[PDB]
Structure formats: structure tokens, C-alpha cells
Amino acid sequence: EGILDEIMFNHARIIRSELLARDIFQEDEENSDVLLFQLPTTCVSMAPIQLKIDLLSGQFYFRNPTPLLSNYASKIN
Amino acid sequence: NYCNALIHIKFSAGTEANAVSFDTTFSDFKEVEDFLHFIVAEYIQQKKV
């Protein structure tokens, strides 16, 4: 079980590091397993959204996804 | 869906009983606050004219 968990975490970290290398998601200092995506909620607002990786099946998910956000998360999956 | 919040706003200006000035839906509280501020500003302008 520990070996499987280590492999899971390593694969997730490798994918996250590739995404950071592509410089699409900024780095989250508070959480090493949370990716920050910059999106403007309004004309002047420019806010980050937290995307997380499922440790079991590995599909990206949002913290409080809107219907469009959920649809595009499914598209990402 | 027992978890998401949907806010339906119906603002009827003082013109007719059935002439609904605006009828919108919102899923983001930030947009709710923005539209509330806009409605308050519009009402203030109407009171100023």
C-alpha cells in the first residue's frame, strides 16, 4: 500500500511539474498538490482558481466548480 | 443539486405591474454583489432625476 501511494504521488508530482514547466499554472506556495489557474472573474478582477488532482483515479477537479467549470473540467479529464 | 447556490433576481421598476425591468439568474456571489451595486446605483440615479 505504501509503495502504491508513493507511485501515485510521484506520478501526480511528475504531471504537475510538467504543467509548471509549460508555465500554464502558477505555483501554489501553501499547497504543493494544488495548482493555481489565473482567470478574470470580472473586467478588472484577476483571481486564481485552485485545481486539485484526485489521488485515486487522477482527474483534475475544481474546489467550487460552476456548470461551465465542471464541463471544462470533464473536457480536461 | 443540493450543493450549488442559484440566485434568481427579478427587479420590477415602477412603471407597470407586469413590465419586469430585469429578470436574471446568477451562480457566482461576486456577480450577485456587482449586479446589486449596479441596481443600487441605478436606483440612486433614478431618484436623482
Q: Is B34 on the interface with A (CB under 8 A)?
A: yes
- Please work out, in degrees rounded to the nearest 5, the angle formed at the alpha carbon of residue B37 by the alpha carbons of B33 and B43: 145
Resolution (A): 4.6
Partners of A42 on chain B (C-beta within 8 Å) are 30-31, 34
A66–B28 C-beta distance less than 8 A: yes
Query: Which H or E run includes A7?
Result: helix A2-21
- Fill in the DSSP letter of residue A2: H
C-alpha cell at B41: 446605483
The experimental technique used to determine this model is cryo-EM
In single-letter form, the type of residue at position B20 comes to: V
Q: Report the SS3 class of residue A5.
A: helix
- Strands B22-26 and B7-11: what pairing? antiparallel
CA distance B14 to B44: 14
- What's the CA dihedral at B6, B26, B30, A69 to 10 degrees? 80
